[PDB]
Ligand binder design. Structure first.
Ligand SMILES: Nc1ncnc2c1ncn2[C@@H]1O[C@H](COP(=O)(O)OP(=O)(O)O)[C@@H](O)[C@H]1O
Ligand SMILES: [Mg+2]
Length: 352
């Protein structure tokens, strides 16, 4: 690969720095490791790099495939787990034997089929089958909020307290929703009071962004001069800088590569906003209004004024609070003081 491959990296040789973050992740320093960061900050990348370098058995649940749904069924969750387990038995010969006595499992012949299941007994059997730590990756774990008919928390707590060879890695692009999922705020919840080893990926600063591009161009062996305009136009999100780098290498026209990145970002961001608006069709026009209003940032008064201007009616403070709270939980905006801002520059652009 190369530094500007437009897919999550799986090798450190293709990945710019984040050395402290990868090393912390790899430390598996508590039974649960949280990987945080906005979309496109490299979370799936460091997880892949981390598990490749550790050379430990693992189950990888890519939950992004549920992002366009409002609900995940027990059946659809089990089919994903089933697929991963089948990869794991190939690495853990004695697992197929250890899964034989699980109530809802059927074996035929070097594979399993589920025919509810005890997630805690399942995890315990991975641990029985392995001399080494087994990593359970829940990539975009906050998606499990949508898995309404299953509560995995007691099983996660059981593992945390009792399964010493089970190490979870849970990532989330929507920080508040991830914490809400794990019920960190609820004293009676199974994971309350338990510490998570936490790694956060922030957007590149100006100097990091410039160094990232510099490194990828030096590696392609091509000249580049305009690093500052690229940062000014694209911003610090690694994923967008990566795409730009790829396009510029492919075409060598600065304005074309910037415009193509901007147009790709806008399309992707607005599709992701549609995922957000799924199940909120009642408040849909209002959310669009809020984001346009907050594009160049604004205060509560600006949000209120713009909503009431569009609809004519007075709008309560309860409704307003709920709309901004949802946007903040899902990482669309961030509140600085009395100022709410899109969480990165191209989200401003997308609603401009
Ligand atoms: N430090 C980095 N070095 C090289 N590429 C990166 C880096 N950070 C992110 N990327 C690239 O940016 C894109 C988004 O990364 P990804 O791991 O999917 O982010 P997340 O899972 O946080 O949304 C991918 O193309 C990835 O290869
Ligand atoms: Mg990801």
């Amino acid at each position: 690969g190369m530094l500007f491959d437009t897919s999550p990296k799986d090798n450190r040789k293709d990945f710019f720095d984040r050395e402290k973050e990868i090393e912390k992740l790899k430390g598996l320093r508590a039974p649960i490791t949280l990987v945080l960061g906005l979309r496109r900050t490299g979370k799936s990348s460091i997880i892949k790099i981390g598990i490749n370098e550790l050379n430990l058995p693992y189950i990888y649940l890519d939950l992004r495939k549920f992002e366009e749904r409002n609900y995940i069924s027990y059946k659809d969750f089990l089919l994903e787990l089933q697929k991963e387990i089948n990869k794991l038995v190939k690495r853990l010969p004695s697992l197929l034997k250890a899964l034989k006595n699980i109530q809802g499992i059927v074996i035929m012949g070097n594979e399993i089929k589920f025919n509810r299941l005890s997630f805690a007994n399942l995890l315990e059997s991975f641990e029985q089958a392995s001399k080494d730590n087994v990593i359970i990756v829940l990539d975009e774990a906050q998606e499990l909020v949508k898995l309404r008919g299953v509560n995995l928390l007691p099983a996660l707590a059981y593992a945390y307290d009792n399964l010493k060879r089970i190490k979870f890695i849970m990532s989330g692009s929507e920080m508040g929703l991830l914490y809400d999922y794990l019920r960190v705020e609820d004293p009676e919840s199974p994971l309350f009071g338990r510490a998570f080893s936490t790694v956060e990926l922030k957007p590149f600063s100006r100097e990091e962004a410039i160094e990232f591009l510099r490194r990828g161009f030096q590696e392609a062996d091509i000249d580049f001069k305009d690093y500052e305009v690229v940062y000014e136009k694209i911003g610090g999100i690694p994923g967008w800088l990566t795409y730009f780098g790829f396009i510029y290498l492919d075409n060598k026209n600065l304005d074309f590569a910037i415009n193509q990145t901007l147009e790709y970002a806008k399309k992707l961001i607005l599709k992701e906003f549609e995922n957000f608006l799924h199940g909120r069709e009642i408040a849909r026009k209002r959310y669009l209004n809020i984001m346009r209003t907050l594009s160049k940032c604004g205060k509560w008064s600006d949000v209120k004024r713009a909503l009431e201007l569009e609809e004519g009616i007075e709008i309560s403070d309860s409704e307003i609070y709920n709309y901004l709270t949802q946007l903040t939980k899902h990482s669309w905006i961030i509140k600085e003081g009395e100022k709410y801002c899109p969480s990165e520059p191209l989200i401003s652009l997308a609603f401009s």
